[PDB]
Amino acid sequence: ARLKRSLLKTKENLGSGFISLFRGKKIDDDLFEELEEQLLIADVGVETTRKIITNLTEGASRKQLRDAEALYGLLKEEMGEILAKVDEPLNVEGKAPFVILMVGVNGVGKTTTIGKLARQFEQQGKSVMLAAGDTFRAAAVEQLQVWGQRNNIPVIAQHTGADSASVIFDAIQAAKARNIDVLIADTAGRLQNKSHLMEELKKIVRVMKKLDVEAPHEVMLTIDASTGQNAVSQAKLFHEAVGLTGITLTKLDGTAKGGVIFSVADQFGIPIRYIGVGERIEDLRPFKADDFIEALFARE
Ligand SMILES: Nc1nc2c(ncn2[C@@H]2O[C@H](COP(=O)(O)OP(=O)(O)NP(=O)(O)O)[C@@H](O)[C@H]2O)c(=O)[nH]1
Numbered sequence: 001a002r003l004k005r006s007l008l009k010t011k012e013n014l015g016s017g018f019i020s021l022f023r024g025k026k027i028d029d030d031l032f033e034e035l036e037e038q039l040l041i042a043d044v045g046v047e048t049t050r051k052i053i054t055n056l057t058e059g060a061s062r063k064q065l066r067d068a069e070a071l072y073g074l075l076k077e078e079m080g081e082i083l084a085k086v087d088e089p090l091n092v093e094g095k096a097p098f099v100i101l102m103v104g105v106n107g108v109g110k111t112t113t114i115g116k117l118a119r120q121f122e123q124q125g126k127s128v129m130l131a132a133g134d135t136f137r138a139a140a141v142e143q144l145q146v147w148g149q150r151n152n153i154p155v156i157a158q159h160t161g162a163d164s165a166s167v168i169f170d171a172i173q174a175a176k177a178r179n180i181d182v183l184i185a186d187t188a189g190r191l192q193n194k195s196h197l198m199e200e201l202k203k204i205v206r207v208m209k210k211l212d213v214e215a216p217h218e219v220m221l222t223i224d225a226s227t228g229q230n231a232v233s234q235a236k237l238f239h240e241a242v243g244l245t246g247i248t249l250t251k252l253d254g255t256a257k258g259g260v261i262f263s264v265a266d267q268f269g270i271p272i273r274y275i276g277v278g279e280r281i282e283d284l285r286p287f288k289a290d291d292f293i294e295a296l297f298a299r300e
Helices: 002-006 015-022 029-041 046-062 068-084 110-123 138-150 164-177 194-208 229-241 260-268 289-297
Strands: 098-103 128-131 182-185 218-224 246-250 272-276 284-286
Touching (some): 002 289, 015 029, 015 068, 015 289, 029 046, 068 260, 098 110, 098 194, 110 128, 110 182, 110 246, 110 272, 110 284, 128 164, 164 182, 194 229, 218 229, 229 260, 246 260
Parallel strands (some): 098 218, 128 182, 246 272
């Protein structure tokens, strides 16, 4: 029930938060407007809120419901369906190496997610290597090097400002030579220039093909739930630039903006591989839609 308390701030307005809104009320246009306002304040987003209201209105009409309290169950089903469409756990087994290209802006949890994932894979018996492909941020590169040395995890890094694609190429070659199961590659996160960063990512992906026609095996976006709609605009920008195959959504604990997960799910349809629900390694949890919905909707 750790997930339940990590969602405590989001549950004021969503899930169990619906109970106080519906109590004793009739289903009418006023109620659907109050619900729409609550969804929007919770960062569910305009398009996804409209879809939820439309589907809920139709679902209640088909059953000729009049008691607003029963909208709780319909919302649980319908918001559950939104998340079920992006429930698909990441499987990194069986490659040599499985290459995860980590993309996203700076400051939203990318290097922390790299460390937690690396520790989780090693805890499962997989060997891990890191590639310090954010080559102009010497602090980020030093962070991976020092942390990897402490953890007996090899880190491939080159001089400040080295070509990111070449660093990652060299890391894949090294991983293949050293029986590495998983290679996790960091990338630059300065999206102030759309064209440049997005051209760098395309170059990285093309260069990988010299060594493995299947690499990268996962392109993972990291976004921060506490940034609300910025998480959605970041996903949209990276989705148009590169072939995203997974999303990690960090910092759900302690934000009232957790509703953004429904917007990310609905707008892009990309699997949410992990959600960050605390500061421990194990608090980067593989995303399971039914578990999340149960925690969000359970009262108390
Ligand atoms: N509570 C919480 N904090 C998280 C989570 N994921 C990352 N963080 C925190 O947010 C920060 C991580 O951001 P970070 O990975 O440093 O982003 P970055 O771009 O790699 N680094 P920088 O901050 O130098 O730009 C740290 O405070 C880290 O502990 C999460 O799921 N929950």
